[PDB]
Short mmCIF file of C-alpha atoms and ligand atoms in Angstrom, two decimals:
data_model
loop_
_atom_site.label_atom_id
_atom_site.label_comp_id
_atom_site.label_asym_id
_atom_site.label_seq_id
_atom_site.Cartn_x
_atom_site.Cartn_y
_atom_site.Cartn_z
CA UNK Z 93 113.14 136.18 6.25
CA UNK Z 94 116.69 136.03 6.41
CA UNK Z 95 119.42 133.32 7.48
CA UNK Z 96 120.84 134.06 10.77
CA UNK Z 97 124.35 132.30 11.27
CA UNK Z 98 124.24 129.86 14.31
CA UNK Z 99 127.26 130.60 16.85
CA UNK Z 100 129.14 127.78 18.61
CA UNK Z 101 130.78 128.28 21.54
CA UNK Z 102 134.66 126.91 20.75
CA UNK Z 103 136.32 124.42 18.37
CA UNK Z 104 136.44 121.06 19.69
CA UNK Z 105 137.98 118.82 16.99
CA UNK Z 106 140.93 117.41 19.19
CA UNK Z 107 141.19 115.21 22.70
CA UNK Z 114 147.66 113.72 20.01
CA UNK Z 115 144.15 112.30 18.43
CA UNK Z 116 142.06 114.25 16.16
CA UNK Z 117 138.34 113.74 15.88
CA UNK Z 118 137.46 114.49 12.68
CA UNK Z 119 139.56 114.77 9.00
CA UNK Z 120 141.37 116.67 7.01
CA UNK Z 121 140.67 117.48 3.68
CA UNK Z 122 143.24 115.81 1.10
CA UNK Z 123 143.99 119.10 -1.34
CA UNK Z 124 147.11 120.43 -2.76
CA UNK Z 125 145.79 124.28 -1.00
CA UNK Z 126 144.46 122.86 1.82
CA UNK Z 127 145.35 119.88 4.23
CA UNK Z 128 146.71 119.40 7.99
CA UNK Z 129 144.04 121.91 9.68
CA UNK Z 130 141.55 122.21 8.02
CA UNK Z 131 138.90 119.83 9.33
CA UNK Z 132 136.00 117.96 6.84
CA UNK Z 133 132.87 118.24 8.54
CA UNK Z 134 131.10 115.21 9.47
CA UNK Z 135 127.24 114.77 8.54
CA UNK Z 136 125.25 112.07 9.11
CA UNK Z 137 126.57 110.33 6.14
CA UNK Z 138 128.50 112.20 4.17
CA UNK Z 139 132.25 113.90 4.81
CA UNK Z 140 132.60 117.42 2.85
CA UNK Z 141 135.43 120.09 3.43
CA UNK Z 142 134.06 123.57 3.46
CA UNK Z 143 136.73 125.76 1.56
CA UNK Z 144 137.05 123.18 -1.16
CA UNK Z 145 133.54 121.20 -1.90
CA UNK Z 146 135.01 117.92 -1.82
CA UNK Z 147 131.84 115.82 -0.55
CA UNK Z 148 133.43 112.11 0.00
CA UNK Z 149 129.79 110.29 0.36
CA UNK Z 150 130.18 106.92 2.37
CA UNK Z 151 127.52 104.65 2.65
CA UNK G 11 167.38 145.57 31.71
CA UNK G 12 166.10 143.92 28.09
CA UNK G 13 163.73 141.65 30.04
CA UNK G 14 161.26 138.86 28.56
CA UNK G 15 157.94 141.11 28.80
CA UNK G 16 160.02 144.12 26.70
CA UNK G 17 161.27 141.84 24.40
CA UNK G 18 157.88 140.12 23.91
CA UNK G 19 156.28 143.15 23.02
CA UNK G 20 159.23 144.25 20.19
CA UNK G 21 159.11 140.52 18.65
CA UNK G 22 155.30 140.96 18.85
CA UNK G 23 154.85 144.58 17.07
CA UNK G 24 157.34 143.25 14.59
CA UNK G 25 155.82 140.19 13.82
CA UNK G 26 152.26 142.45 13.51
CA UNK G 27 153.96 145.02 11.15
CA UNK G 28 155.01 142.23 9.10
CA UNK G 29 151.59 139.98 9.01
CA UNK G 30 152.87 137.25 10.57
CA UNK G 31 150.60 136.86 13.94
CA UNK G 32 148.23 134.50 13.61
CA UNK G 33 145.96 135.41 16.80
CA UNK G 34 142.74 133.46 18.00
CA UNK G 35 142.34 130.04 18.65
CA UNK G 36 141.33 128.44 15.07
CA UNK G 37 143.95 130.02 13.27
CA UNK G 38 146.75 129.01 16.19
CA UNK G 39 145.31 125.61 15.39
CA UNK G 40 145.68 125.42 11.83
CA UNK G 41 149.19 127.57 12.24
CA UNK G 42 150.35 125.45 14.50
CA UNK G 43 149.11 121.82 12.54
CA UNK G 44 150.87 123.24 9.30
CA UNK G 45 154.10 123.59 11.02
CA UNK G 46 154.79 127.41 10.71
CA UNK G 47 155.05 128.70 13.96
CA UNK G 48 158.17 129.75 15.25
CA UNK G 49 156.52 130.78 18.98
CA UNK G 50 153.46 130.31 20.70
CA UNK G 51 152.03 132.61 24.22
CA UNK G 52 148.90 131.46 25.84
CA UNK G 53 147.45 133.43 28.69
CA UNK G 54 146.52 132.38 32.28
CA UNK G 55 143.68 133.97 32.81
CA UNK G 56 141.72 131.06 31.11
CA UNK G 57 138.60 129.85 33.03
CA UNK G 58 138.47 126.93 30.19
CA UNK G 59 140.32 123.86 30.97
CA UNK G 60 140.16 122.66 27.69
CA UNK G 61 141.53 125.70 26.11
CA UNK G 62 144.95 126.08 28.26
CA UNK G 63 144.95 121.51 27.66
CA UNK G 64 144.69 122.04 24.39
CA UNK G 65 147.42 124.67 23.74
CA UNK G 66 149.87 122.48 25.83
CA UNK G 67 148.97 119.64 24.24
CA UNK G 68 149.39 120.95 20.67
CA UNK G 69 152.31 122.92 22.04
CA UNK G 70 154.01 120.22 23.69
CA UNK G 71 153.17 117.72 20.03
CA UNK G 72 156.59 119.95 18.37
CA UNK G 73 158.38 121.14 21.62
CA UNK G 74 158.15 124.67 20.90
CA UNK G 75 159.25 127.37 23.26
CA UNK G 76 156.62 128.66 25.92
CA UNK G 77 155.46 132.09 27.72
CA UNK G 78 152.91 133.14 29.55
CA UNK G 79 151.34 136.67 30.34
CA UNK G 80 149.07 136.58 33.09
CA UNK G 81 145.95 138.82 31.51
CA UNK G 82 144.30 138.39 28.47
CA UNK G 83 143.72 141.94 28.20
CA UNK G 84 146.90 143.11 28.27
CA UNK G 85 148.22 140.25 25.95
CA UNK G 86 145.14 141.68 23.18
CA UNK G 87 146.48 144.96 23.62
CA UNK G 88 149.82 143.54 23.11
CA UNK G 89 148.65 141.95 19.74
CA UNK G 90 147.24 145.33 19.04
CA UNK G 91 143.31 144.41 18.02
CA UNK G 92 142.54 147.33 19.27
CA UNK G 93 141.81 151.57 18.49
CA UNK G 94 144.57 153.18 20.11
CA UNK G 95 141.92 156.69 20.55
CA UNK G 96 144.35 159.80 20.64
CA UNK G 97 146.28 158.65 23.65
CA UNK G 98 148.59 155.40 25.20
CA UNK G 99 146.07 154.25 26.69
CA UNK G 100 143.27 152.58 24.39
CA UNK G 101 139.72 151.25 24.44
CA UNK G 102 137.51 148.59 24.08
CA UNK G 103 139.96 145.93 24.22
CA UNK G 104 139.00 142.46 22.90
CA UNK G 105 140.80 139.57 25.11
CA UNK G 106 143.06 137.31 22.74
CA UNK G 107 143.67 134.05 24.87
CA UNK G 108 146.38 132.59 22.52
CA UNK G 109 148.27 133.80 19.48
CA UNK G 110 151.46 131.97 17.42
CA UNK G 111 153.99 133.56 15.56
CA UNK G 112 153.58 132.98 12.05
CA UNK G 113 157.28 134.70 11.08
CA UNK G 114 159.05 137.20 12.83
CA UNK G 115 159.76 139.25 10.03
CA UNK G 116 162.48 141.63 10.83
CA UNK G 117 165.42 139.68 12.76
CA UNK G 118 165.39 142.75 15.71
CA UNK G 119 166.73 141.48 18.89
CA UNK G 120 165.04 138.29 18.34
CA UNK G 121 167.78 136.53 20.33
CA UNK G 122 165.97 137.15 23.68
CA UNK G 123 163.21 134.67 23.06
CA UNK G 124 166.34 132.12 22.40
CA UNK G 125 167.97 133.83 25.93
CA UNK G 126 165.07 132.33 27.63
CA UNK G 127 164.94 128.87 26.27
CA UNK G 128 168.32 128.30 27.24
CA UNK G 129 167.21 129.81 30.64
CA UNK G 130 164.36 127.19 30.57
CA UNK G 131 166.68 124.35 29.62
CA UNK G 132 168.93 124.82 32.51
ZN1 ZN M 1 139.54 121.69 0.88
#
């Protein structure tokens, strides 16, 4: 078996109020969202995984 | 007459031959977040509400000059996503809803666009 890439149908990160963050990087930063798991926060292009208990 | 539409499709090829079109909706987000655009052109023929909300919202957040088009076929075509196939007329055209101008690139009767923000601020 393979992995087959889940589709979503649009971005929906907005309402100005944002709903998620953005990743704090020199590269990257104002656009780029950090996704929001359960617990943890973790920016894709990047890797940083700020944990929060 | 140099009208708006002829204009928007010479600022539009030039800002394609010099990779600055950002077109979709994702990368008019983070384009237009990082605060390099210099235009932005949604299209009407949005069934979405949230799309066209968003777009003026975000537009509206730094005041940057509007146009519309009226078919999102014809404003992917203008874009140019798409195989021209021997003749003018081309096929399989993908819609593009929105699309921000990352640069203009060649300063070509770029004026116009400036024409019709004065004609909007009247
Ligand atoms: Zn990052």
């Amino acid at each position: 078996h393979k992995r087959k890439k889940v589709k979503l149908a649009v971005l929906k990160y907005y309402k100005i109020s944002r709903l998620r963050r953005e990743c704090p990087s020199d590269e990257c930063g104002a656009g780029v969202f950090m996704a929001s798991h359960f617990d943890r926060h973790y920016c894709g292009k990047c890797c940083l995984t700020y944990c929060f208990n | 007459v140099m009208d708006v539409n002829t204009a928007l499709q010479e600022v539009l090829k030039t800002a394609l031959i010099h990779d600055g079109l950002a077109r979709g909706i994702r990368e008019a987000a983070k384009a237009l977040d990082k605060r390099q655009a210099h235009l932005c052109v949604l299209a009407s023929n949005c069934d979405e509400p949230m799309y066209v909300k968003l777009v003026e919202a975000l537009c509206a957040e730094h005041q940057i000059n509007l146009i519309k088009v009226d078919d999102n076929k014809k404003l992917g075509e203008w874009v140019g996503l798409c195989k021209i196939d021997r003749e003018g007329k081309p096929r399989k055209v993908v819609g593009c809803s929105c699309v921000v101008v990352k640069d203009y690139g060649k300063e070509s009767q770029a004026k116009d666009v400036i024409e019709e923000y004065f004609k909007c601020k009247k």
